């Protein structure tokens, strides 16, 4: 029967578009009165709504920009692309959805940036001695994995303030290690050492001039160093088109946010770059540690992949921490850091092994889901990532987007990107809704009687207390405008009980079996007789209970034909002139003659 698009009785094109995606709106001025204004496109089009007046917006997804996925890259960047398509145009109706797919590939030789952030508590003297040659060896090992490399360095101990700092007799201010009769640098929060550079030997030349320091308590203020290494991009030299590695080597647990309150530090971490011309961290002594929530935000923003190269005794702790920060991994750093190089290479190997998507700037009105095709021609609903990818592999995802209502702003753009990659797919959404026939509405034009309504899409949307297609009726006016013979006979209902009258005109409401018509709703197109289960035998048109049979058919049910071919005799005359053709057979009037053509006697 009639669909919600019709039975919900929406009086505006915009309302109909919100009723359901399948509803379609007609703006034809010549639409017959009572014809369903809005309905499923099939039904309404069957009602011959002009294509010049049909309104039926439909969701679509058009790719605006698409560079092919790069194959080797690593040289003459020329837009090394790892995500396709790059830009998509999307549009949707209040209750619609669309499917679009994103393809991700990991270039084999993509450049790399390694920043070595090394804790320098007094226990790390052996590690510092060990890693002196990490430069050249790292370059030779990585050259098997990428043709361009950049190496940096940095160190951190803890906030140089009591209770962490040794404020013990003045010697401890200039040589905190004087207690055990050794010389070491006065502790510090974080000092940048070496900007990222292609010249590897500079790493060796610099790391050989460093020294450890000493602090009182066991936890270390690494997270300050991590935050400063993420946000101070120009000091450290993070590249735009490259892979970012932040190696964080420590042998002790860390202070977290709100640990500074034990010192005189209450101000939170705003997450800004405070490294000055001096390569130290200025705001160390006046600013709390960063929360994990802020660190993840900054890491995602800057496209940093952070590797926890921690010792055995705290591997579990940092594993549990990394469980909260996407993109990180943990490795067992030996007590003397002898295996830092292999740890770095393996961590890079298993960091490139996974692809995961992030959605950012997604508006509230929108919501979307994912299907993954990671290892073979397979589909994994819901999951947004892959767990066993080989470098150089290609991955695909299918994205389903959903919306609610026509928001206040008609256009919004958001970005879908994989974790840690500069490349991104920006989806710009063009939200519905509007209709051409409604954009051309006439405010209170005389198309509506004495105004009393605004014309749009062939119908006057009437004002308060006003009713009718032309606002010819008003509830208040119904009191003085006493009805006069709404039906021809006094004592009978103002109309056929299928409807009532306003200002002497009957309103037939609605019907499911057909369309109501007539001055008093007393005629329609579904009350005629039936034959063989079909009204008027499918050979006539019903009208107010009468079958208007086609020219080739007659009778009340239109079940009998007037065709002459079957009744024409061999002489070219019907029934040989002896009878009349009825229902395709001749009835003979000449005495003694009989047969379908009066040929027998």
């Amino acid at each position: 029967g009639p669909n919600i698009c019709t039975t919900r009785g929406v009086s505006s094109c915009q309302q109909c578009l919100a009723v359901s995606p399948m509803c379609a709106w007609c703006s034809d001025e010549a639409l017959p009165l009572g014809s369903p204004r809005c309905d499923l496109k099939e039904n309404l089009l069957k009602d011959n709504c002009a294509p010049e007046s049909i309104e039926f917006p439909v969701s679509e997804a058009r790719v605006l920009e698409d560079r092919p996925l790069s194959d080797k890259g690593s040289g003459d960047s020329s837009q090394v692309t790892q995500v396709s398509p790059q830009r998509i145009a999307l549009r949707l109706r209040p209750d619609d959805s669309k499917n679009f797919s994103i393809q991700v590939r990991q270039v084999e030789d993509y450049p790399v940036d390694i920043y070595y952030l090394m804790d320098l508590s007094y226990s790390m003297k052996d590690d510092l001695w060990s890693i002196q040659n990490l430069g050249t060896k790292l370059a030779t090992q990585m050259r098997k994995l990428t043709s361009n490399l950049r190496i940096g360095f940095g160190a951190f101990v803890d906030k140089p303030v009591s209770p962490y700092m040794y404020i013990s007799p003045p010697e401890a201010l200039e040589n905190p290690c004087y207690d055990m009769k050794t010389t070491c640098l006065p502790m510090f929060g974080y000092k940048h050492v070496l900007t990222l550079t292609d010249q590897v030997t500079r790493f060796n030349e610099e790391v050989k001039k460093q020294s450890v320091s000493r602090n009182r308590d066991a936890p270390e203020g690494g997270f300050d160093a991590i935050m400063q290494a993420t946000v101070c991009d120009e000091k450290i030299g993070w590249r735009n088109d490259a892979s970012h590695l932040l190696v964080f080597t420590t042998d002790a647990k860390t202070h977290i946010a709100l640990d500074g309150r034990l010192a005189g530090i209450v101000q939170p971490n705003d997450g800004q770059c405070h490294v000055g011309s001096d390569n130290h961290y200025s705001a160390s002594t006046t600013m709390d540690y960063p929360s994990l929530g802020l660190m993840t935000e900054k890491l995602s923003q800057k496209n940093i992949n952070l590797i926890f190269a921690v010792t055995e005794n705290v591997v579990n702790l940092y594993q549990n921490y990394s469980e909260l920060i996407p993109g990180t991994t943990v490795g067992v750093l030996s007590m003397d850091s002898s295996n830092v190089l292999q740890l770095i290479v393996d961590a890079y190997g298993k960091i490139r092994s996974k692809v995961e998507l992030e959605v950012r700037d997604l508006p509230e009105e929108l919501s979307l889901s994912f299907n993954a095709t990671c290892l073979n021609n397979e589909v994994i609903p819901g999951l947004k990532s892959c767990m066993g990818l080989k470098i150089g592999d290609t991955v695909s995802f299918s994205i389903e987007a959903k919306v609610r209502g026509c928001p206040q702003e008609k256009e919004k753009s958001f970005t879908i990107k994989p974790v840690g990659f500069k490349d991104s797919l920006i989806v710009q959404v063009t939200f519905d809704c509007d209709c051409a026939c409604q954009a051309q509405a006439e405010p209170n034009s005389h198309r509506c009687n004495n105004g009393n309504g605004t014309f749009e899409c062939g119908v006057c949307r009437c004002g308060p207390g006003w009713l009718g297609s032309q606002c010819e009726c008003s509830e208040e006016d119904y009191r003085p405008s006493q009805q006069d013979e709404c039906s021809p006979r006094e004592g009978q209902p103002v109309c056929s009980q299928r409807g009532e009258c306003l200002c002497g005109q009957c309103v037939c409401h609605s019907s499911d079996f057909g369309k109501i018509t007539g001055k008093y709703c007393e005629c329609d197109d579904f009350s005629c007789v039936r034959y063989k289960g079909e009204m008027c035998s499918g050979h006539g048109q019903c009208s107010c209970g009468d079958c208007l049979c086609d020219s080739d058919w007659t009778g009340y049910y239109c079940n009998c034909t007037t065709r002459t071919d079957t009744c024409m005799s061999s002489n070219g005359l019907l029934c040989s002139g002896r009878g009349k053709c009825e229902c395709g057979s001749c009835v003979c009037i000449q005495p003694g003659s009989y047969g379908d053509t009066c040929e027998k006697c």
Binding site: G1, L258, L262, S527
Partner: protein, 927 residues
């Protein structure tokens, strides 16, 4: 719900963190009351002390003047010449302030101390306790435990509290390699053993926690504390927070308040959420069992997209008599807001009987100025939806305002009957006091006893005229009550509307009697007592012809308003209405429904049927008229519809039209859910006590040989809310078998004249001409009956010879349709090449007989037998037969032996027919 938003604002010296820690001050020696606010970074007048800090007590009304408390004015004591014993500079004095009656306790967590044994700078911490007059210094951690492994870094005073029995509770998070500690002492002992010349006083009654295994280092036990009895012994037990315990999960310890044994351990769920940052204990459900609240500012929740986001969380652990707690969680509302930073019990804020709690988000809200949420307790626990949201009103100056970072409540500053709130905003160096508005509960009892109005009851006169109108009455009542200080009389302004539903822009039909208006208002007074201040009035309707919306009920609507201005106290504190008040109560009336006293008409939907025919012959497909009348002698029915069901083999031809003494109908057909139902409309309304006789036409294309009767069902339904549908009824007619075969036969020619022209006798014939004129026959057979028959027989008898002389001779026969034939004598027995009248036939003549089989014939199906014969002229030309006219006769018959509809009664059908040929003489003898 009831906190004001026009508070009293206090300000301190710039950059002094004024407002870091706040609380009230309630002396027993004076009627006045004062606030206490800490300024941990304020400068003081002590010799050579930089940013020593101070605590200031601020008057409530005397221009909100804030004045420092002179706890002490000395500098660093000298253990020896130019050998300072203590370093008061940057000691953060005033970081935490607590008071109880004339007692004030303030602490300096960062106070540094040079131990006697070895010159050092260890942040041991200290606290000053000031009685009503006397002032002393309480530094429990300043002991011989100089090393960091002992108590050198206790930072005693990081958090503090008072028990019911005047026992101090003090926490130091740095003791024993930052394991933490929890130290308690009797106030009387503290104020009775102080001695300036003794630096490490050994108190007798004190009890404190002790060292544990190194696995527990960096736990920060004592980061936050509270008190409340859980042992059930009536003595307060200590609550403390351990934000770094259990691999940074965070833990909360409850210690027995009598001998310091452990009672319970709470464990956080998420890593690094800093569970236990702040704790509080108050009975949130009025069960007399104190509940526990624990804050986790950095807890990371994950939303719909699955991304973890830092919003903060607070855990509520109701106490239960069995000793176990019932836990639920409460998450924040904004990212990085650090919801749960401060948890301050408010006491029974609205005096509804259940204690209420406020939880702070000092970094949330627009521009991140800070926000405070108010939660109301209830019997079932805490109401998870905040009932109020205080917000900051200052901008950052190098520092986030941190409004709500520290709070205090549960003290009635102005004796208005309700407690109040102090909120610290040390980020902008401010403290703000919110006063609780008295809560007034009201009740409305609007009612209209003439709920249904009879138009004929025009008893009341229209004012100003003798015309009488059907009137209607309205009564409305109010009463107000509330705790605390309130005027004994309250002024309420109230509003009334009679047909508010027509406020869409239509004409209202109901009007007040004297005011002749659709809306009315009244300004009335109530004495804040249990006596209801009812009022009454009269209203009437417009005339009957002025409206027709009988079904649409009239809407009665009311609103009431407080005159807050007149009800405010001397300080301008407006009252407030309770939260859950239906300030827009309403009623309705029914213009009037047909059934009178009852809106819901309960039609006695009823139906009876009649039939024009009682049996249907299979295969006829002839229309038949079924007669049905709907009566529903009971109450009226609205939108009554008729439902009829027919089988698949049946079709609904339509409504009857040829009958003038029978009512027509509007009818349709439905097949939804693969059904075969006919639908007809009776009318709206179907008048009560009425009978509507109508009829319908149907036809069945039944051809099955197994069915024997039809199934026909009927029902009536309406839109009425009660007695909606009629019971199902049915009609029955049996199927019948009627097959009617016919046999006619024919001859050509039917008469002959003798002698045959140019004919002569012969010894024996060889061709047709040797015999005489040709005679031909056709025996057509067809089933004119509607029903089919499976098998039938046909028979023919022929007068072959008379007196051994042939009369008629058969040459050959042909068959059309499904028949086969056999003869008792060889057809073409001689194998010839292809006045009064005497009667001859098989009864006297030698008879030749033919029998034929007939197969199944359906309606109108036919088979034909054709026969050709000759007339024997020789027999009539013989001497003994000359000049005599003869008539030749033949007969045929049939029988229907079998029918296909075995399941129905079956019987054979038979009949007979005759054909004749006449012979006469043309050249007759002369008369």
């Amino acid at each position: 719900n009831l906190d004001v938003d026009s508070p009293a604002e206090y300000s301190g010296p710039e950059g002094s963190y004024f407002g870091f820690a706040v609380d009230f001050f309630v002396p027993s020696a004076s009627s006045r009351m004062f606030l206490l606010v800490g300024a941990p970074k304020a400068n003081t007048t002590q010799p050579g002390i930089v940013e020593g800090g101070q605590v200031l007590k601020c008057d409530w009304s005397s221009t909100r003047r804030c004045q420092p408390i002179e706890f002490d004015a000395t500098g660093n004591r000298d253990y020896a010449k130019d050998d300072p014993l203590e370093f008061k500079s940057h000691q953060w004095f005033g970081a935490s302030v607590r008071s109880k009656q004339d007692k004030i306790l303030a602490c300096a967590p960062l106070y540094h101390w040079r131990t006697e044994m070895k010159q050092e700078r260890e942040p041991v911490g200290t606290c000053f306790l000031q009685d009503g007059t006397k002032t002393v210094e309480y530094a429990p951690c300043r002991s011989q435990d100089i090393d960091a492994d002992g108590q050198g870094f206790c930072q005693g005073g990081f958090s503090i509290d008072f028990t019911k029995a005047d026992r101090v509770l003090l926490g130091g998070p740095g003791s024993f390699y930052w394991q933490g500690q929890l130290i308690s002492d009797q106030v009387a002992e503290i104020v009775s053993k102080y001695d300036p010349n003794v630096y490490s006083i050994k108190y007798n009654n004190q009890l404190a926690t002790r060292t544990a295994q190194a696995i527990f280092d960096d736990s920060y036990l004592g980061y936050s504390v509270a008190v409340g009895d859980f042992n059930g012994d009536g003595i307060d037990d200590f609550v403390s927070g351990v934000p770094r315990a259990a691999r940074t999960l965070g833990m909360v310890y409850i210690y027995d308040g009598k001998n310091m044994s452990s009672l319970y351990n709470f464990t956080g769920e998420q890593m690094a959420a800093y569970f236990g940052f702040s704790v509080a204990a108050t009975d949130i459900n009025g069960d007399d069992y104190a509940d526990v609240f624990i804050g986790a500012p950095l807890f990371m929740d994950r939303g719909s997209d699955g991304k973890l986001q830092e919003v903060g969380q607070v855990s509520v652990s109701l106490q239960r008599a069995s000793g176990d707690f019932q836990t639920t969680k409460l998450n924040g509302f904004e990212v990085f807001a650090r919801f749960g930073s401060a948890i301050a019990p408010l006491g029974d804020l609205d005096q509804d009987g259940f204690n209420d709690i406020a939880i702070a988000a000092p970094y949330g809200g627009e521009d991140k100025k800070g926000i405070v949420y108010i939660f109301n307790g209830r019997s079932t626990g805490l109401n998870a939806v905040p009932s109020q949201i205080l917000e900051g009103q200052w901008a950052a100056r190098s520092m986030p305002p941190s409004f709500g970072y520290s709070m205090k409540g549960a003290t009635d500053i102005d004796k208005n009957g309700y407690p109040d709130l102090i909120v610290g905003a040390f980020g902008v160096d401010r403290a703000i006091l919110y006063r609780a508005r008295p809560v007034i509960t009201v009740n409305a009892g609007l009612e209209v006893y003439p709920s249904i109005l009879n138009q004929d009851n025009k008893t009341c006169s229209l004012p100003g005229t003798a015309l009488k109108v059907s009137c209607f009455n309205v009564r409305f009542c109010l009463k107000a009550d509330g705790k605390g200080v309130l005027p004994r009389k309250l002024n309420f302004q109230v509003e009334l509307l009679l047909d508010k539903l027509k406020q869409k822009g239509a004409i209202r039909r109901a009007l007040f009697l004297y005011s002749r208006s659709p809306s009315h208002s009244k300004n009335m007074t109530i004495s804040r007592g249990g006596l209801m201040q009812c009022e009454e009035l009269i209203a009437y309707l417009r005339d009957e012809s002025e409206f027709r919306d009988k079904l649409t009920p009239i809407t009665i609507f009311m609103e009431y308003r407080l005159d807050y201005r007149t009800a405010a106290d001397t300080t301008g504190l407006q009252p407030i209405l309770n939260q859950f008040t239906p300030a827009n109560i309403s009623r309705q009336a029914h213009i009037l429904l047909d059934c009178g006293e009852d809106n819901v008409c309960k039609p006695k939907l009823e139906v009876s049927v009649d039939s024009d025919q009682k049996k249907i012959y299979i295969g006829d497909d002839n229309p038949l008229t079924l007669i049905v009348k709907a009566q529903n002698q009971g109450e009226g029915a609205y939108e009554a519809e008729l439902i009829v069901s027919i089988p698949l083999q049946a079709d609904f031809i339509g409504v009857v039209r040829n009958n003038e003494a029978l009512a027509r109908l509007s009818c349709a057909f439905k097949t939804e859910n693969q059904t075969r139902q006919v639908v007809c409309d009776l009318g709206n309304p179907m008048k009560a006590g009425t009978q509507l006789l109508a009829g319908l036409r149907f036809s069945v294309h039944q051809q099955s040989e197994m069915d024997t009767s039809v199934k026909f069902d009927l029902q009536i339904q309406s839109s009425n809310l009660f007695d909606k549908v009629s019971p199902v009824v049915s009609h029955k007619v049996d199927l019948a078998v009627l097959a009617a075969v016919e046999i006619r036969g024919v001859s050509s020619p039917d008469h002959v004249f003798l002698p045959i022209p140019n004919w002569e006798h012969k010894e024996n014939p060889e061709t047709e001409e040797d015999v005489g004129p040709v005679v031909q026959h056709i025996y057509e057979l067809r089933n004119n009956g509607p029903s089919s028959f499976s098998k039938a027989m046909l028979h023919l008898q022929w007068p072959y010879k008379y007196n051994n002389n042939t009369l008629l001779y058969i040459l050959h026969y042909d068959i059309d349709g499904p028949m086969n034939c056999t003869s008792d004598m060889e057809i073409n027995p001689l194998r010839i090449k292809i006045g009064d009248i005497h009667t001859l036939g098989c009864g006297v003549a030698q008879c030749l007989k033919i029998v034929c089989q007939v197969g199944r014939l359906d309606r109108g199906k036919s088979a034909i037998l054709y026969v050709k014969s000759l007339l024997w002229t020789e027999t009539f030309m013989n001497k003994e037969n000359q000049n005599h006219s003869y008539s030749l006769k033949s007969s045929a018959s049939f029988n229907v032996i079998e029918f296909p509809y075995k399941n129905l009664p079956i019987e054979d059908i038979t009949n007979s027919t005759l054909v004749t040929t006449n012979v006469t003489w043309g050249i007759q003898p002369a008369p």
